[PDB]
């Protein structure tokens, strides 16, 4: 119980190695064993990570559960959590058992499917626990490998193109960040994230090529990290990989792609860009505001034009991340708390919606909106669940969707009214595409022979959704469960950002 | 005791909505109906025993972040107590009325189950409105605000197999979201100017807010005027005021009992209530009130003309609600919020009855809604005829002209028309003209349905019969409000300035009172002192419209047909409801869909993906083909490359020089 973060990080990876070695047979019993072994492993990781959650002390804004060991090439293996990153660990471990349970009907290469998800979980958890600069980059980039194969092997008809675009687009943005990490390593003489959080990187302007670089070295380091996190988030206009990868991935892949991997971009902004490059962040605030405002309006209108149900959900995520980006760079307590809440909240809602798509994809094997209609007539439970998360997706008060949206909008209002006015229009636009999709798929008359015999959600499918409905309602009604944890850490973060602004 | 009223309807709806299978449909219906009645009794006790000391009952913390804190809390002042009896009374009756109106529905086949779901929606709808009116802070007011939006969308689209209902419910949600866009911007502005979203703390700081300049978009604004305008944009959408009205007429696609609850208790009254709850701010915002009147008065006129030519019974009553809410916004704008609440309270009674009355007609007439096929019916439906007649009496304002004795809407409307004269010449004249149009379409409704030759298919006409007692007892109880309510509460709401002050327990900071009226405001007084030609004009115009209705349907019944032919373009304009929907489809809907497809295919596809693919799949492969070509396989070419490399490097070394 002194290496708790290392256990939850590498336990899923170790289980995959054992499964790959000592699990034999390709029959259904052999596959049935793999599903159970994965489910027990993901459940174990979630339970152990609850010890972190409840022993965590929100008042302490330092890193807790810290473990440090020597490593290679003069680096250190250091892990830990604070009020900004603890909840992203629990979100990852929370979605993984539900994601496994939703694949229970997959019959194609099951053992390999389970291994890819078990390996992916360990690497996703490492991103949020790592306190070494290179160690963060290792988990940040290693996650591309299992996801590249998850899309390639189990994806749709365009999965070859989607998997390559996903990997290379993300890979391109992070290699620039790698060089910035090497530069910070050389200036500060350390890769320790706690030590880099107090280091003062130079901000005096200089000239590079034909332009002045406002912010000096901080701006150059800021732009390298921005390229990595902007693509990961994703921000507009570097988002066009997401409508491919999220759509062409298998349903389980889409859940983890949207619920967890997107949060690495926003967490990157909260861990590095604002603490380590405050002067550059202050300078970039106007541009980030309008890119995020454009993203909300742009992708909301693009979602309204989609003929493919899974693409509506994919484009919805880009709009929801636009709020997160604005909240982070408003750099006030209200905006940053809203940004973190919006990230966690979007994990439950977006994941649930991709599971709603899978429920009817499994039965009908199509994603065209026009291929459905009046499903409420045969699928009462599905229409209720799909409606609930449709309403959460439009930020209805009472669901967790509202809180994150509301606070990021109010934090931005304090800084820029034009941005807040444009971003706030998302409430009108989100309702438009979200309700139209729900109506066209679920409501109406059952007038197609194909849908005549469609079945309702099975008991297993209902039980996957119940935890997600619980978190959405609980956090919507009692968000203090989140802000108590993140409150003190955001307060310290916002204070350092202010104390670093040029005077 | 207050918590039971607030939370009992939610618990009943959850039990009935999700667990009716365990306990059966009948137990679910009675649970919701019975629990509403108990809360209605507790609401009346809270209302009639209020001593004038506002109470604050906390429940839970909602949103805490740094200095921002909003809580689930219950505030009980005069305004809350008034809205309680209005919401619970009408909701309780609508539950009873629904026990018979939905007893056997033709929209559903016998396999489908709807009764338990319907009563759960009504209970939750009641819960949302109750949460709205008991709000202690602006954020909880928003939850209920959006709560009625989702409950209405559930109920307006109750018949999910009817594409007309699904479109109508979607429209209501979106249009009300356009209103919530301004509401939200007001909440953001208020928090940053005052550091709080709690009503009392906001009101304490209002005097400074009136002297404050706030930057917003391209210029600085007086804070109070801007904030009052922004919060009013929310009220316009929720009350179906002008330019945000098109959703209310289409809400008829839901069941008739839903229309009564939306149009008299829960949804439309929210906008006026917010104006009256936030009066401590609008009193210090002279320009915001100006805009409220112009919208309020123009809506009363706009919605009166359109009602003249509509042929669907519910759509006539639909526009009457919009026009009536126009009146209450004029009264608040002129600075008389008690009169606005007074008409809101009286309106709840006779408007609910008119809709519950029209449900009986539709229910009796084999569910036909076109008034062109509604002749006779007076002898076939005795009680619904008189209840509708009482509703017409109240809304028209049938009383003794210069006295203080008459039906509910006679007194409350006169208070608004008297205040309009003292407050705005624009307001006073449009209201009486609308009051003239009100009488025509109200009595036109009576004569078309309850008089004349039995007109239309004889089958239903012959089979027409009075609906069971469950649908008529709620109508009767309402009638006990659409006659005596105005006389009962005239004094406490409008009669005497001292009487009004104690009832509402109202420069000093405008805090502690249910409403506030700035000292420099005396419109309520000037209304009393108004001349006699003011105090009688409503009676004159009401009669004037009545005689035209009598002249148009009993005698010379061909006049309505002939006139449209004389002035046909003005017939289409009213019939098409001033073409507002067509304008929006042209200016908003079609452009939005077109914009999304262009951004989707032109932006993401041609510009962004076209570039990325053009480089990744166009350029780099082109450089690959050049590299493959240069690897020619000829030994002499490879040696040439080595010689070019040395020669190029030597040129480089020479330029640097010896050094
Ligand atoms: C909605 C349109 C927004 C708008 O008009 O902004 C007002 C903009 C707000 O800026 P400000 O804070 O008051 O002062 C800006 C100075 O440049 C102060 O400038 P600065 O010293 O702070 O430094 C520059 C600052 C200046 O930033 C600005 O505020 C000016 C430019 C911002 C972007 C303009 C809108 C972009 C497209 C909107 C579409 C949304 C969907 O940052 C930028 O230059 C941002 C550039 C935008 C990057 C995003 C481009 C992505 C690809 C496209 O003010 C004006 O330009 C004057 C008012 C004009 C209103 C006209 C709008 C039409 C009527 C509706
Ligand atoms: C900005 C625009 C605002 C203009 C407002 C002016 C309002 C007056 C309306 C003028 C008449 C329009 C018109 O020709 O409509 C016609 C109606 C007549 O009644 P109906 O039974 O509803 O008509 C249907 C008939 N069977 C038909 O098909 O024609 O006409 C009526 O509704 C007649 C009532 C006139 C108003 C009486 C009250 C004031 C005196
Ligand atoms: C780390 C050091 C631990 C030791 C190495 C473990 C080697 C695993 C192993 O035993 O070999 C592969 C295993 C044997 O299977 P075999 O008997 O050959 O065939 C029948 C069963 N398929 O067969 C397997 O289980 C093959 C599984 C293939 C992987 C599944 C495909 C999806 C991708 C999985 C996640 C990503 C893996 C790559 C991660 C490293 C990145 C460089
Ligand atoms: C060669 C590598 C690229 C060099 C980048 C230098 C560009 C630059 O000027 O950086 C600052 C830039 C604009 O900031 P600016 O408006 O110049 O600041 C106000 C005072 N001049 O700052 C930004 O645009 C902020 C980053 C925007 C992110 C997209
Ligand atoms: C936070 C607030 C969130 C509000 C937005 C979500 C509301 C969900 C309502 C479900 C509507 C789905 C569309 C529909 O037609 O519903 C049918 C479904 C089944 O109806 P049933 O009575 O089971 O009859 C079977 C059919 N013959 O109908 C139902 O299942 C009705 C369920 C009763 C709901 C009553 C309203 C109470 C508020 C519920 C909030 C939480 C909902 C979580 C579950 C999803
Ligand atoms: C993922 C990373 C993979 C690294 C590269 C591949 C290494 C493969 C090593 C050889 C594995 C052979 C094998 O499957 O044996 C199963 C086999 C057990 O299979 P069983 O007896 O059928 O359960 O294991 C062995 O015989 C050797 C032990 C595993 C190899 C050493 C691991 C350290
Ligand atoms: C498969 C993954 C295997 C487990 C990963 C390493 C967990 C490290 C926990 C400490 C282990 C220990 O006691 O050795 C101390 C040992 C030496 O340092 P010491 O603690 O000062 O003795 O440190 C390590 O084991 C560091 C290894 C880090 C490897 C991370 C690379 C992959 C990401
Ligand atoms: C603009 C800035 C750069 C953005 C790049 C975004 C990531 C790339 C997205 C598209 C990748 C296309 C993948 C095709 C997959 C496929 O079907 O392959 C099988 C297939 C090969 O044949 P098969 O193996 O027989 O199926 O692909 C092709 O035939 C097309 C070959 C395309 C070669 C792409 C290699 C270059 C892209 C990666 C490097 C980008 C460097 C950017 C440098 C500038 C930075 C500023
Ligand atoms: C709750 C009980 C659900 C039973 C519904 C049922 O049996 O319907 C049968 C029914 C069809 O089965 P049949 O009766 O066999 O035809 O399905 C429905 O119509 C259900 C409609 C509602 C769907 C949502 C189900 C989940 C509700 C609970 C959400 C999670 C609560 C978390 C609590 C913690 C936070 C406060
Ligand atoms: C505050 C001062 C006055 C403000 C002036 C603006 C007034 C509000 C504009 C309202 C426009 C109408 C919205 C409803 C459109 C119909 C959608 C619907 O549910 O019908 C089904 C309708 C058609 O379905 P069908 O009837 O089944 O064929 O659905 C759609 O067409 C899909 C949704 C279209 C997207 C709507 C975008 C709304 C943009 C509004 C922006 C307003 C900007 C001004 C501020
Ligand atoms: C879009 C159309 C923009 C036109 C707004 C004109 C408002 C005006 O002239 O009244 C200023 C008028 C006089 O200036 P004050 O000293 O701020 O009262 O103020 C108001 O009544 C402001 C009310 C907010 C109006 C909406 C602004 C946001 C758009
Ligand atoms: Ca720092």
Nearest-CA distance A410 → chain B (Å)? 5
User: Least CB-CB distance to B142: which of A374, A397, A424?
Assistant: A397
- Sign for the pseudo-dihedral over CA of B547, B549, B550, B555: positive
A-interface mutation test, from B65, B117, B214, most A Cβ less than 10 A away: B65
**Cis geometry, peptide bond prior to residue A234 (ω within 30 degrees of 0):** yes
Find the farthest-apart pair of alpha carbons in chain A and give their distance in angstroms, rounded. 71
In terms of DSSP H, where are the helices of A143-277?
A: 144-154, 159-188, 193-198, 216-232, 242-248, 251-256, 263-268, 274-276
DSSP classification of residue B495? I
Q: Which residue shows structure tokens 């105005």?
A: B486
- From the list B357, B374, B376, B368, the residue with the least C-alpha distance to B317 is B357
Q: Which DSSP string do the residues of B541-584 spell out, in sequence order?
A: HHHHHHHHHHHHHTSSTTHHHHHHHHSHHHHHHHHTGGGHHHHH
Comparing alpha-carbon positions, the chain B residue that sits nearest to A399 is: B143
Q: How far is the CA of B166 from the centre of ligand 1 (A)?
A: 39
Q: Measuring from each residue's beta carbon to the nearest atom of ligand 11, which residues come in under 6 Å?
A: B 221-222, 225-226, 229, 287
Q: What is the 3-state secondary structure (H, E, C) of B253-314?
A: HCCHHHHHHHHHCCCHHHHHHHHHHCHHHHCCCHHHHHHHHHHHHHHHHHHHHHHCCCCEHH
Ligand 1 atom showing the smallest separation from residue A287 Cα: 48
* Burial status of residue B636 (CB atoms within 10 A of its CB: 0-12, 13-18, 19 or more): exposed
- Cross-chain residue pair A421–B217, CB shorter than 8 Å: yes
User: Which positions of A make up the binding site for Ca(2+)?
Assistant: 197, 275
Nearest-CA distance B520 → chain A (Å)? 34
Ligand 5 atom showing the smallest separation from residue B120 Cα: 35
**Cis geometry, peptide bond prior to residue A270 (ω within 30 degrees of 0):** no
- Inter-helix orientation angle B223-238/B286-307, to 10°: 20
Residue A479's H or E segment, with its range, is: none
Q: How far is the CA of B198 from the centre of ligand 9 (A)?
A: 36
Q: Which DSSP string do the residues of B411-477 spell out, in sequence order?
A: HHHHHHHHHHHHH-HHHHHHHHHHHHHHHHHHHHHHHHHHSSS--S-HHHHHH--PPPHHHHHHHHH
Listed in sequence order, the residues at least 6 apart from A124 whose beta carbon sits closer than 8 Å to its beta carbon are: A92, A139, A143, A256, A260, A261
Helix/strand/coil for A208: strand
> Resolution, rounded to a tenth of an Å?
2.3
The CA distances from residue B415 to B86, B322, B411, in Å, are 20, 19, 6
A47-55 contacts, C-beta under 8 A, 24 or more apart: A48/A4, A48/A7, A48/A8, A48/A11, A49/A8, A49/A89, A49/A90, A49/A93, A50/A90, A51/A1, A51/A4, A52/A4, A52/A5, A52/A8, A52/A81, A52/A86, A52/A89, A52/A90, A53/A86, A53/A90
- Angle at CA of residue B571, ends B566 and B575, nearest 5°: 165
B-interface mutation test, from A234, A397, A403, most B Cβ less than 10 A away: A397
As residues whose CB is below 5 A from the ion ligand 12, the structure lists: A 275
- What method did the depositors use to determine the structure? cryo-EM
Helix/strand/coil for B56: strand
Contact of B493 with B339, CB cutoff 8 Å: yes
- Residue B168 CA to residue B147 CA, distance in Å, equals 18
Ligand 5 site, residue A384, Cβ cutoff 6 A: yes
- Residue A238 CA to residue A230 CA, distance in Å, equals 7
- Residue A339 CA to residue B393 CA, distance in Å, equals 56
B-interface mutation test, from A236, A240, A437, A488, most B Cβ less than 10 A away: A240
Residue A407's H or E segment, with its range, is: helix A400-413
The alpha carbons of chain B give a radius of gyration, in whole angstroms, of: 31
- Cross-chain residue pair A240–B604, CB shorter than 8 Å: yes
Tokens encoding A138: 């290792």
Residue B63's H or E segment, with its range, is: strand B55-65
- Cross-chain residue pair B608–A431, CB shorter than 8 Å: no
Q: Which DSSP string do the residues of A323-362 spell out, in sequence order?
A: HHHHHHHH-SHHHHHHHHHHHHHHHHHHHHHHHHHHHHHH
Residue A440's H or E segment, with its range, is: helix A426-442
- Residue owning the nearest CA to atom 12 of ligand 4: A214
Contact of A166 with A244, CB cutoff 8 Å: yes
Ligand 5 site, residue A387, Cβ cutoff 6 A: yes
């Amino acid at each position: 119980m002194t290496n708790l973060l290392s256990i939850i990080t590498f336990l899923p990876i170790v289980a995959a190695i054992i499964m790959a070695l000592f699990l034999r047979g390709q029959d259904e019993a052999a596959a049935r064993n793999a599903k159970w072994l994965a489910l027990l492993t993901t459940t174990a990781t979630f339970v152990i990570s609850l010890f972190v959650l409840f022993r965590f002390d929100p008042a302490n804004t330092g890193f807790q559960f810290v473990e440090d060991h020597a490593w290679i090439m003069g680096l250190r293996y250091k892990m830990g959590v604070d009020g900004i990153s603890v909840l992203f660990v629990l979100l990852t471990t929370f979605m993984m058992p539900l994601t496994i349970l939703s694949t229970w009907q997959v019959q194609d290469k099951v053992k390999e499917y389970m291994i890819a998800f078990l390996v992916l979980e360990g690497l996703m958890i490492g991103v949020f626990t790592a306190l070494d600069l290179v160690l963060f980059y290792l988990f940040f980039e290693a996650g591309l490998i299992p996801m590249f194969l998850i899309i390639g092997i189990w994806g749709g008809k365009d999965r070859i193109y989607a998997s390559f675009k996903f990997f290379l687009y993300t890979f391109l943005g992070s290699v620039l960040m790698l060089v910035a990490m090497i530069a910070m390593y050389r200036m500060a003489g350390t890769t320790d994230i706690p030590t880099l959080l107090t280091f003062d990187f130079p901000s005096e302007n200089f000239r590079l090529l034909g332009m002045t670089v406002v912010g000096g070295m901080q701006m150059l380091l800021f732009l390298a990290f921005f390229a990595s996190f902007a693509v990961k988030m994703p921000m507009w206009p570097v988002h066009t990989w997401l409508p491919d990868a999220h759509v062409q991935a298998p349903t389980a892949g889409s859940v983890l792609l949207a619920a967890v991997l997107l949060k690495m971009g926003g967490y990157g902004f909260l861990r590095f860009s604002l603490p380590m490059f405050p002067v550059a962040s202050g300078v970039a605030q106007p541009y980030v505001f309008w890119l995020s405002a454009i993203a909300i309006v742009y992708t909301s209108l693009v979602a309204l034009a989609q003929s493919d149900m899974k693409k509506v959900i994919a484009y919805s995520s880009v709009a929801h991340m636009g709020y997160v980006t604005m909240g982070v760079f408003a750099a006030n307590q209200i905006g940053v708390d809203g940004a973190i809440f919006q990230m966690l909240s979007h994990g439950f809602i977006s994941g649930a919606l991709f599971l709603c798509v899978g429920v009817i994809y499994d039965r009908m094997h199509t994603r065209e909106i026009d291929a459905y209609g009046g499903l409420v007539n045969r699928m009462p439970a599905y229409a209720a669940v799909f409606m609930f998360f449709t309403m959460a997706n439009v930020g209805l008060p009472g669901t967790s969707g509202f809180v994150g949206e509301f606070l990021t909008l109010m934090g931005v209002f304090r800084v820029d009214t034009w941005v807040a006015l444009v971003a706030t229009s998302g409430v009108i636009l989100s309702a438009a595409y979200a309700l139209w999709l729900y109506r066209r798929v679920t409501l109406g008359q059952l007038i197609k022979e194909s849908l005549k015999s469609i079945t309702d959600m099975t008991p297993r499918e209902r039980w996957v959704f119940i935890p997600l409905i619980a978190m959405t309602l609980i956090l919507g009604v009692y968000p203090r469960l989140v802000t108590d944890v993140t409150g003190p850490a955001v307060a310290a973060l916002v204070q350092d950002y202010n104390q670093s602004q040029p005077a | 005791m207050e918590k039971f009223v607030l939370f009992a309807p939610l618990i009943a709806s959850l039990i009935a909505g999700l667990g009716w299978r365990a306990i059966g449909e009948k137990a679910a219906q009675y649970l919701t109906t019975g629990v509403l009645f108990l809360s209605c009794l507790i609401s009346w006790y809270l209302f009639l025993s209020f001593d004038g000391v506002p109470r604050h009952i906390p429940v839970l913390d909602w949103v805490v972040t740094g200095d921002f804190h909003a809580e689930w809390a219950i505030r009980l002042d005069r305004l809350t107590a008034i809205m309680l009896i209005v919401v619970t009374t009408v909701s309780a009756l609508v539950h009873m009325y629904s026990l018979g109106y939905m007893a056997h529905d033709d929209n559903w086949t016998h396999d489908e189950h709807y009764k338990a779901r319907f009563f759960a929606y009504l209970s939750f709808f009641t819960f949302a409105m109750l949460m709205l009116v008991t709000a202690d802070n602006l954020l909880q007011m928003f939850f209920g605000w959006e709560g009625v939006g989702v409950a209405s969308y559930l109920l307006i689209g109750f018949y999910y197999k009817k594409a007309s209902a699904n479109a109508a419910a979607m429209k209501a949600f979106i249009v009300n979201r356009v209103g919530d866009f301004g509401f939200l911007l007001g909440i953001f502005g208020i928090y940053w100017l005052t550091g709080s979203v709690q009503f009392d703390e906001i009101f304490r700081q209002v005097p400074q807010l009136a002297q404050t300049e706030m930057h917003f978009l391209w210029r600085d604004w007086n804070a109070a005027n801007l904030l009052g305008f922004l919060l009013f944009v929310g009220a316009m959408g929720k009350s179906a005021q002008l330019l945000l009205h098109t959703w209310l007429p289409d809400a008829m696609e839901g069941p008739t009992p839903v229309s009564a609850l939306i149009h008299a208790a829960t949804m439309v009254t929210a906008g006026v209530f917010l104006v009256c709850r936030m009066s401590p701010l609008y009193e210090f915002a002279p320009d915001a009130k100006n805009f409220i009147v112009i919208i309020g008065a123009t809506t009363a006129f706009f919605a009166a003309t359109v009602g003249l030519v509509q042929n669907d019974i519910k759509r006539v009553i639909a526009y009457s609600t919009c026009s009536q809410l126009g009146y209450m916004f004029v009264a608040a704008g002129v600075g008389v919020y008690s009169a606005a609440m007074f008409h809101l309270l009286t309106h709840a009674f006779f408007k609910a009855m008119l809709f519950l009355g029209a449900g009986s007609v539709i229910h009796a007439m084999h569910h036909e809604q076109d008034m062109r096929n509604y002749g006779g019916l007076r002898k076939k439906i005795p009680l619904t005829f008189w209840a509708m007649m009482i509703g017409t009496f109240a809304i028209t304002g049938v009383g003794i002209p210069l006295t203080h004795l008459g039906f509910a809407g006679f007194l409350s409307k006169d208070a608004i028309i008297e205040s309009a004269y003292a407050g705005s010449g624009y307001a006073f004249w449009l209201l009486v003209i609308a009051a003239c149009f009100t009488s025509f379409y109200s009595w036109r409704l009576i004569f078309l349905t309850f008089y004349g030759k039995p007109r239309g298919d004889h089958h239903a006409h012959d089979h027409a019969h009075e609906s069971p007692p469950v649908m008529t007892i709620p109508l009767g109880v309402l009638a006990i409000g659409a006659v005596f309510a105005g006389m009962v509460w005239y004094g406490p709401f409008f009669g005497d300035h001292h009487k009004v002050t104690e009832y509402f327990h109202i420069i000093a900071a405008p805090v502690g009172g249910a409403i506030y009226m700035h000292p420099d405001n005396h419109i309520m007084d000037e209304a009393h002192h108004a001349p006699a030609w003011v105090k009688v004009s409503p009676f004159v115009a009401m009669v004037l419209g009545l005689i035209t209705a009598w002249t148009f349907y009993i005698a010379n019944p061909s006049l309505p047909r002939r006139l449209a032919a004389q002035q046909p373009a003005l017939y289409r304009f009213l019939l098409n409801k001033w073409y507002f929907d067509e304008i929006y489809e042209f200016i908003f809907v079609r452009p939005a869909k077109w914009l999304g497809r262009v951004l989707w295919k032109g932006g993401d596809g041609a510009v962004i993906d076209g570039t990325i693919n053009g480089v990744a799949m166009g350029l780099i492969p082109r450089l690959t083909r050049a590299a493959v070509r240069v690897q020619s396989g000829y030994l002499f070419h490879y040696a040439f490359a080595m010689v070019l490399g040395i020669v190029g490097l030597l040129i480089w070394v020479m330029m640097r020089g010896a050094h």
